[PDB]
């Protein structure tokens, strides 16, 4: 039974899970875009968002500095987190990351996901775009919208 269990069991245990997520998060901060197995990306996404929140807390915040020191294994990324990533998202309140599914890994057919920090300098991912508003169904719905607006 795992009712309400919100954390996956990864790696070799709890510490190993944290270290795996830490390595993934460090890679995400360094490269701003990471391919990894979909479950590990999904597990690490929350930590990525929380890292951006801690970076927003400020460079001088001692708790934020300690959290960044733990979660970034390469220490040149801590200035990056506090002076690039957090300022990039100061306006936003959430959704700092974008996670998309990728064709399965050729090695072991693993479910793969690409996770990026929004607003990076890299080429944009081929995002899924909704149908054009000029399609037949959308135009009929636009007609409904206009009639409803006029009538009521």
């Amino acid at each position: 039974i795992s009712h309400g269990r919100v954390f996956r069991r990864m790696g070799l245990g709890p510490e190993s899970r944290i270290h795996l997520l830490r390595n993934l998060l460090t890679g995400l901060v360094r490269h701003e875009r990471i391919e990894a197995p979909w479950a590990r990306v999904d597990e690490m996404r929350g930590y990525a968002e929380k890292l951006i929140d801690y970076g927003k807390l400020g460079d001088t915040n001692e708790r934020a500095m300690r959290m960044a020191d733990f979660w970034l294994t390469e220490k040149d990324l801590i200035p990056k987190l506090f002076q690039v990533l957090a300022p990039r998202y100061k306006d936003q309140t959430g959704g700092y990351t974008r996670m998309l599914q990728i064709p399965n890994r050729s090695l072991d057919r693993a479910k793969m996901a690409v996770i990026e920090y929004k607003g990076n300098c890299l080429p944009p991912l081929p995002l899924p775009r909704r149908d054009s508003h000029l399609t037949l169904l959308n135009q009929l719905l636009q007609g409904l919208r206009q009639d409803l607006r006029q009538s009521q």
Binding site: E74, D76, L77, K80, Q83, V84, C121, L122
Partner: peptide, 12 residues
């Protein structure tokens, strides 16, 4: 070199 992540934004 390693450990040379810039503290500034990047543009391609």
């Amino acid at each position: 070199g390693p450990f040379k992540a810039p503290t500034i934004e990047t543009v391609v």
